[PDB]
Amino acid sequence: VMLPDGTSAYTRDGSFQVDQNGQLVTAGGFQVQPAITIPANALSITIGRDGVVSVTQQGQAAPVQVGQLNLTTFMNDTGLESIGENLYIETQSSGAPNESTPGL
Amino acid sequence: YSNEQEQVLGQIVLANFANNEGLASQGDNVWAATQASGVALLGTAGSGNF
Amino acid sequence: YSNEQEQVLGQIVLANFANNEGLASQGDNVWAATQASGVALLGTAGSGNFGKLTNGALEASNVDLSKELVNMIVAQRNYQSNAQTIKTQDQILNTLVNL
Amino acid sequence: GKLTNGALEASNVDLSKELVNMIVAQRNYQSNAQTIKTQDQILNTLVNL
Amino acid sequence: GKLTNGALEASNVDLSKELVNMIVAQRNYQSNAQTIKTQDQILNTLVNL
Amino acid sequence: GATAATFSLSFLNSMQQNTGANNIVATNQNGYKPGDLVSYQINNDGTVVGN
Amino acid sequence: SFSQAVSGLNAAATNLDVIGNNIANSATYGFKSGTASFADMFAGSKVGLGVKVAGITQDFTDGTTTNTGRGLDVAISQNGFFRLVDSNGSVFYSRNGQFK
Amino acid sequence: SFSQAVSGLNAAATNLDVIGNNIANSATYGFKSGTASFADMFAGSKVGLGVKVAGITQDFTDGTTTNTGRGLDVAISQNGFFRLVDSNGSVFYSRNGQFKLDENRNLVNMQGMQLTGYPATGTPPTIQQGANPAPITIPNTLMAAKSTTTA
Amino acid sequence: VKVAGITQDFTDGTTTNTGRGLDVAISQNGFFRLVDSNGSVFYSRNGQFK
Amino acid sequence: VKVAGITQDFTDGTTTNTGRGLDVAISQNGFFRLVDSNGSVFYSRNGQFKLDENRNLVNMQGMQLTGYPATGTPPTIQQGANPAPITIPNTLMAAKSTTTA
C-alpha cells in the first residue's frame, strides 16, 4: 500500500474499499499498490486465486481486467515495524520486499 | 383517466454511487451523500448499471 | 392465413453451454451467461447436441419433495449439533473466565 | 367463429383435475409449513443458548 | 366505486399470513430479549469487578 | 471428386452347407462419416468415452 | 432465512385459492379457468431467496355447448367476445351469452 | 476455536436455506434443484480450522413433461436453453415454455422478456440461419397476392 | 485497538410482496432520491411511498 | 502431555447416488490425482467433477483431473504415458476412409 508520503507500507488485512475516484484503497483510506481502478459502471468484482482482478460491465460480452494484485514477501517477517492501522514498514532486519504473484 | 387516455406524470430517477459504503446514514432508513461516497450518478431504472 | 397458405415467421433458436453449472441465476427462472459457463453455442432443435421441442407441453421442475423433506431433517440435526459445539465452547470460556 | 343459437357455452373447468391439483397444492403447503417449523426450531435452539 | 345491494364487505384479513407474521415477530422479540440479557451480564461483570 | 476408398473385403468364417437359404449372417466395416460430439460419460473402469 | 419459506407458503396459498375458485365456478356459463404462474427470485447470492407468483393466466379454451331451448341465449364458438356497455359508457367483453 | 463451530453453523444454515428454496419451488416450470457443496478449510495446523461453502450446484436434469394443451407451451427435452432478450438487449437463457403473445405481437414469457430466433426473409420467406437471432413477432399484416410464374 | 470504521453490507434483501400499488422495490443497484422541506438531497432504499 | 499427532480415519464412506454423469466415487482404496494451476500435484477422494470453460475436467476448486491420455487413430489409452489433465473437446470428429470390410 502507498502511504501519503509516497513510501510503501505492507498490510495483511484485506477489507478493501473504493474511494470517490474509483480506485482500490485499504479500509483506512490508504491506496493499495498496484493502482487497481474499478470503473463507475461495475456490476461484479472477481478477484481470482492468483490476484487477477476483473470486472464485468453491462452489455459487454467479456469480463474486463482492471489490474493485478501482487503479494510482497520478506525473508524476515518479524523485523517489520508496525506503524498502526494494521500496517508494517520495512526495516533493515526485515530483509527487502520481494514482489511475487499470489501462487508463485 | 376516464377518457380512456393516459398521461405520464414523471419518471422515478435512481442514483448510483462510486463507493456505496462511504454513504453517511442519517436515520429514518435514509442515506446522505458524502465526500467518501462521491457525487451521485443519476439514471433511469432498468438501464445501464441501474 | 385465410387463403389456405402458410408462412414462416421465425425459428426458435436454442443455446447450449460448455458448463451449464456456470450459469448465474438471475431470478424469474432465468439464467445468465458468464465466463465460467462459457460462450453460448446457438443452434436448431433436433440437430447436433440439442434435444427436440415438445409443443403443447410444459417442463415441470425436478424437485422431489420426499427427498427434500428427508434432507431438511438431516440438516436440522447437523445444525443442532453445531449449536451444541458452540455452547460447549461457551461453557469452556466461562470456566476459564471464572478463575 | 360463428354463433350457435339456443345454446350456452359452459365453463371449461374439469372437476377431476381441480381436485387432484388441490391435493398436490395441499401437500406443497404442508411441506412449506414443515420448512417454517424447521426454521422455528433452529431459532429456538439458538435463543436457548 | 359501485355499490352492491344485499351484500356486505368482509374484512381483508387473511389468518395464515398473520399467524406466520406472529411467529416471526415472536422470534424477533426473543432475540431482542436475548440482547437485553447480554447487556445485563456485561454491566454485572463491571459492577462486581 | 473425392478419393475412392480402397479396402480389403474378406469373406472369412463363411460356410456352404445345407441351410434354409442363402442368407448373410453379418457385415462389418471400419469406416464412418463425419460426426459431431453428442454426449460424454465416465465408464465404470475409469475411461472417459465420448459418443 | 424465513423469507423463502414465507414466500413458498404464500405461493401455495395463492395456487390453492385459484384451484378453489375454479372449483366454485364449475357450473358457470362463460367462465374460463385460471392457473398461477410461479417464478423464483434469486437476488445476488446463490441461496435462492424464494418464490413469487409471476401472474395468473386464463385458459381461453371453448367449453361444452349446451342447448337450453330459449331463443335469446347465444353461444360463441372459436374466437370472439361479446361486447357490452354499462350505464356510464364503459366498454366490456364477455363470453356469457345469457341475454334478456 | 469459535470460528470452527461458526463456520459449521453457517454451512448448515446455507444447506437448510437451499433445501427450503427447493421446497418453495416445488411447482415451478423450468426450475432446477440446487445443492450446496462444502469443502475443508485446513490452514497449516492439522486441527481442521473449519468448513466453507464452495458453491451451489444446479441439477440440470429433465423434469416431467406435462401436457397443458396451449399452443404457446413448448418444453425442451434433453439439453437446450431458450434465448431471451430484455429491454436493455441483455441476453438471457431459460427452460420455461410459458410464452404469451403480447400487444406488439412478439413472443414473450410471463415476465416480458422477448423470445429470440432466426428470422425469415425473402419471398417466399425462408429461415436464413446466417443471421443473428432476432425477437420473434407475429404481425396481422395481411399477406399480399402472388401472380403465378409456374404452373 | 481503534474502531477503523462501521461498514455497511449492501447486499440485496428479499423482495416481499405486499400488494400496495404505491410500493416500489429496488432490484440490483440503485437508490431512491428524496428531498425534504429544506431541499437537502437524500437517498433511500425504502419503497413504502404515500 | 504432548499431542503426538492427528490421525485420519481413511474408512470408506456411504456412496450416495446423485444422477450426474460427471459425478464419480471411489470404492475401496485409491485417490483421484489433480493438478493445480501452478503444476502442483494433489490427491483427493471427492468426486464432484465438472467441465470448465476450456473443456477440462476440474473439481469445484478448479484443479484439473489427470489421467492417461489417448493417442492414435483410433485413440487408445497410453498406459506408458505420463498422466495429463483430462479434456473433453467438442471439435468435429473427421471421417475415416474405409480400410477393412
Side-chain angles (χ1 to χ4, degrees):
Chain A
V1 182
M2 201 195 88
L3 295 173
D5 315 327
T7 88
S8 323
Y10 304 91
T11 182
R12 155 158 298 217
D13 190 359
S15 176
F16 296 123
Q17 323 195 310
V18 56
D19 43 358
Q20 25 185 348
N21 302 6
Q23 264 203 310
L24 222 65
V25 298
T26 294
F30 291 8
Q31 167 184 2
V32 43
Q33 327 186 6
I36 299 181
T37 312
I38 272 155
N41 296 346
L43 301 176
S44 35
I45 304 94
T46 288
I47 326 165
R49 274 250 300 281
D50 46 0
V52 186
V53 181
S54 311
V55 304
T56 75
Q57 293 245 297
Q58 193 84 62
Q60 260 186 354
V64 201
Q65 164 160 355
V66 310
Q68 225 282 355
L69 196 70
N70 294 320
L71 272 147
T72 306
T73 205
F74 297 99
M75 198 149 40
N76 171 331
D77 271 303
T78 284
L80 291 166
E81 183 74 328
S82 174
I83 66 182
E85 312 286 279
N86 287 354
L87 299 169
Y88 314 116
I89 71 185
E90 142 191 17
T91 64
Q92 102 161 69
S93 323
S94 60
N98 181 325
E99 312 175 20
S100 301
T101 297
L104 264 307
Chain B
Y1 289 72
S2 167
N3 69 348
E4 51 285 6
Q5 210 93 351
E6 84 179 353
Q7 221 179 58
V8 70
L9 289 156
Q11 187 170 23
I12 291 167
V13 65
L14 293 189
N16 178 315
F17 295 93
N19 195 3
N20 298 246
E21 285 92 0
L23 287 170
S25 193
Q26 303 264 280
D28 313 328
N29 33 57
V30 160
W31 307 88
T34 296
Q35 196 151 340
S37 62
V39 78
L41 186 66
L42 298 182
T44 48
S47 87
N49 12 306
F50 300 93
Chain C
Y1 293 100
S2 35
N3 56 351
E4 186 283 299
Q5 185 84 20
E6 72 266 30
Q7 154 171 350
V8 71
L9 289 97
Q11 200 217 29
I12 272 156
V13 76
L14 295 187
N16 167 48
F17 298 91
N19 174 15
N20 323 298
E21 317 100 41
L23 291 168
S25 282
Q26 296 284 64
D28 316 52
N29 42 295
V30 154
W31 282 277
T34 313
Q35 63 178 353
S37 62
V39 189
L41 266 276
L42 301 183
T44 62
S47 88
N49 73 37
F50 301 93
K52 71 156 202 180
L53 311 191
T54 324
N55 185 24
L58 259 172
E59 194 183 341
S61 60
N62 58 350
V63 175
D64 199 6
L65 273 206
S66 309
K67 309 190 58 177
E68 310 302 300
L69 287 172
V70 172
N71 303 0
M72 177 153 338
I73 296 178
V74 180
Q76 179 148 320
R77 293 302 150 191
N78 298 1
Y79 197 112
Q80 288 185 358
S81 177
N82 293 295
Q84 211 71 50
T85 295
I86 286 182
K87 100 170 293 295
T88 286
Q89 302 255 40
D90 253 13
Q91 294 191 301
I92 288 179
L93 273 204
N94 204 16
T95 279
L96 256 286
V97 166
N98 268 4
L99 269 56
Chain D
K2 59 166 334 180
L3 305 200
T4 310
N5 238 33
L8 277 146
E9 149 165 333
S11 58
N12 58 351
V13 171
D14 191 3
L15 272 194
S16 316
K17 325 208 137 180
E18 294 317 306
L19 293 181
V20 183
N21 297 357
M22 173 164 300
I23 282 180
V24 182
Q26 183 177 4
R27 279 304 166 284
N28 302 1
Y29 197 115
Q30 296 181 3
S31 313
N32 285 298
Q34 229 59 15
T35 297
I36 294 179
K37 194 203 320 302
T38 282
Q39 303 265 273
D40 261 10
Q41 310 214 320
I42 286 327
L43 274 206
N44 192 351
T45 297
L46 254 73
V47 185
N48 277 4
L49 285 202
Chain E
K2 317 216 176 24
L3 275 40
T4 305
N5 184 17
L8 259 164
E9 193 184 342
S11 58
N12 60 350
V13 173
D14 157 81
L15 264 172
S16 318
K17 162 201 174 188
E18 292 319 302
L19 287 180
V20 181
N21 296 359
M22 230 179 55
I23 281 181
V24 185
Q26 221 204 310
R27 281 312 165 291
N28 300 0
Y29 194 91
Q30 291 183 0
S31 325
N32 276 19
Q34 205 62 53
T35 278
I36 271 288
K37 171 180 173 185
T38 281
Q39 310 269 9
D40 203 18
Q41 298 206 240
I42 286 162
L43 230 192
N44 180 239
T45 81
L46 285 180
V47 159
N48 287 178
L49 238 58
Chain F
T3 301
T6 312
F7 64 100
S8 173
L9 182 105
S10 182
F11 298 98
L12 221 57
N13 159 5
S14 306
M15 208 146 42
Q16 173 180 188
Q17 308 232 51
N18 192 229
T19 198
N22 44 287
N23 38 44
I24 292 165
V25 180
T27 204
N28 323 61
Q29 60 91 35
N30 49 13
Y32 44 100
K33 72 184 200 274
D36 43 46
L37 189 56
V38 152
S39 66
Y40 53 90
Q41 65 184 62
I42 300 174
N43 208 345
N44 172 22
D45 75 318
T47 57
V48 193
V49 180
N51 323 313
Chain G
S1 151
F2 259 115
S3 300
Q4 43 204 20
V6 169
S7 72
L9 211 78
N10 293 359
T14 298
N15 193 4
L16 267 165
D17 294 11
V18 171
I19 293 162
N21 168 59
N22 292 358
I23 289 194
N25 280 287
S26 94
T28 301
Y29 302 120
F31 183 73
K32 303 308 178 188
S33 66
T35 303
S37 98
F38 305 102
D40 44 61
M41 25 174 47
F42 284 65
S45 299
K46 335 283 302 202
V47 282
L49 270 295
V51 82
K52 57 172 303 274
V53 182
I56 286 191
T57 86
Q58 219 85 7
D59 183 308
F60 275 104
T61 302
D62 303 68
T64 314
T65 314
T66 37
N67 279 347
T68 57
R70 183 166 109 237
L72 262 303
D73 317 70
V74 178
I76 205 189
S77 60
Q78 282 106 66
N79 221 347
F81 286 84
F82 273 162
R83 187 181 180 271
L84 315 169
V85 292
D86 73 332
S87 298
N88 298 346
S90 298
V91 188
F92 290 96
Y93 313 107
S94 189
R95 311 255 310 174
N96 183 315
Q98 182 154 328
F99 298 121
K100 71 184 181 191
Chain H
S1 147
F2 261 123
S3 301
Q4 315 194 0
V6 165
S7 69
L9 212 82
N10 296 359
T14 301
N15 189 5
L16 260 170
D17 291 16
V18 168
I19 293 161
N21 174 58
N22 292 3
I23 280 195
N25 281 288
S26 207
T28 300
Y29 298 117
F31 181 73
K32 312 271 148 259
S33 98
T35 303
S37 292
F38 309 104
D40 306 6
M41 222 169 50
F42 284 59
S45 297
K46 320 164 195 172
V47 298
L49 293 204
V51 59
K52 85 185 161 271
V53 183
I56 304 296
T57 51
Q58 309 268 350
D59 183 316
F60 279 103
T61 313
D62 305 22
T64 58
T65 318
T66 89
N67 285 344
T68 65
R70 304 208 319 120
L72 289 196
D73 310 35
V74 48
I76 312 183
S77 65
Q78 281 101 342
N79 192 354
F81 285 81
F82 287 125
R83 188 184 180 275
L84 312 170
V85 289
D86 72 319
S87 316
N88 182 354
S90 302
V91 52
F92 299 114
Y93 311 92
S94 190
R95 314 259 289 142
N96 202 15
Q98 281 204 300
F99 299 119
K100 71 181 181 189
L101 204 168
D102 60 357
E103 65 283 29
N104 281 55
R105 295 312 211 111
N106 309 37
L107 287 186
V108 316
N109 65 351
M110 292 339 314
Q111 303 83 39
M113 316 187 180
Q114 301 159 296
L115 185 67
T116 68
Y118 296 122
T121 60
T123 307
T126 54
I127 297 300
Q128 77 144 359
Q129 321 144 356
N132 315 66
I136 277 165
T137 205
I138 301 165
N140 220 239
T141 301
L142 194 88
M143 143 184 292
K146 174 132 153 297
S147 35
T148 301
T149 61
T150 279
Chain I
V1 208
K2 172 176 54 65
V3 185
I6 301 268
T7 178
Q8 225 83 7
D9 175 301
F10 278 107
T11 48
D12 219 37
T14 318
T15 305
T16 54
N17 294 256
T18 303
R20 301 196 43 249
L22 268 196
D23 305 7
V24 180
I26 293 207
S27 274
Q28 263 84 60
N29 219 303
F31 295 77
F32 290 128
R33 187 181 177 273
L34 313 167
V35 294
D36 39 354
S37 55
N38 299 346
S40 302
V41 277
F42 294 110
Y43 309 93
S44 192
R45 301 276 290 212
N46 202 13
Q48 250 207 59
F49 301 124
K50 58 186 259 172
Chain J
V1 72
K2 170 184 181 302
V3 183
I6 301 270
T7 312
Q8 223 82 4
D9 173 338
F10 276 105
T11 46
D12 313 278
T14 88
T15 86
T16 315
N17 82 325
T18 89
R20 305 167 27 87
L22 291 173
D23 180 330
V24 65
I26 300 155
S27 51
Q28 313 274 10
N29 218 328
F31 293 74
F32 293 125
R33 184 183 177 273
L34 310 174
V35 64
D36 177 24
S37 324
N38 302 345
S40 302
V41 280
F42 296 104
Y43 310 97
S44 65
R45 302 280 301 260
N46 156 283
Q48 208 78 293
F49 300 118
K50 65 157 167 68
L51 260 162
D52 85 89
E53 187 176 355
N54 284 55
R55 291 329 192 92
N56 331 293
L57 286 183
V58 304
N59 64 315
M60 301 305 307
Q61 295 80 39
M63 312 225 197
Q64 293 107 60
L65 192 47
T66 67
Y68 298 126
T71 65
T73 306
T76 314
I77 308 108
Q78 290 292 78
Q79 298 203 339
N82 288 174
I86 308 206
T87 292
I88 282 175
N90 83 3
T91 182
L92 194 33
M93 150 167 205
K96 175 202 194 63
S97 71
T98 302
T99 60
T100 57

